[model samples]
Target: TRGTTDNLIPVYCSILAAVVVGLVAYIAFKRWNS
Candidate 1:
């Protein structure tokens, strides 16, 4: 359980980071193009 939790934590964090990056890029593109 401990090892699995450790592995899962990074995966969750990476996914969250990706989502934030994508959102920021999208917003930037929308404002820039408009």
Candidate 2:
């Protein structure tokens, strides 16, 4: 369980980072278009 939790932490962080980057990019795109 400890090992799985450790592994999942990175996965969750990566997913969160991806989501943040995507949101930033989307906002930038919207601003550029407008």
Candidate 3:
């Protein structure tokens, strides 16, 4: 259980970071195009 929990933390963090970066890039692209 501890091993699984440790693995999940980095997995979730990467997903969260990717989502945030994607959102920022998407917004920036829209602003630039507009």
Candidate 4:
């Protein structure tokens, strides 16, 4: 359980980071081309 929790924490952070980066890129993509 401890190991699972530890491993999952980074996964959540990475997913969150990716989501934020994706939104930023999406906005930039729209702004630049639109």
* Model 4, CA-based lDDT: 0.89
TM-score of every model versus the real structure: 0.44, 0.43, 0.44, 0.41
Clashing pairs in 2: none
lDDT of candidate 1 over 1-34, digit per residue (tens) = 8888677887888898999899999989999999
lDDT (0-100) at residue 32 of candidate 4?
98
Cα error, candidate 3, residue 16 (Å): 2.1
The predicted structure with the larger TM-score, 3 or 4, is 3
Task: Flag regions of model 2 displaced more than 4 Å.
Answer: 1-12
Lowest summed lDDT window (length 10), candidate 2 = 1-10
lDDT of 2 by residue, 1-34 (tens): 8888677886888898999999999989999999
Per-model clash counts, in order, read: 0, 0, 0, 0
Tens digits of lDDT, candidate 3, 1-34:
8888777887898898999999999999999999
Give the per-residue lDDT digits (tens) of candidate 4, residues 1-34.
8888777886898898989999998989999999
Off by over 4 Å in 4: 1-15
Span of 10 residues, lowest total lDDT, candidate 3: 1-10
Residue 11 displacement in candidate 4 (angstroms): 9.0
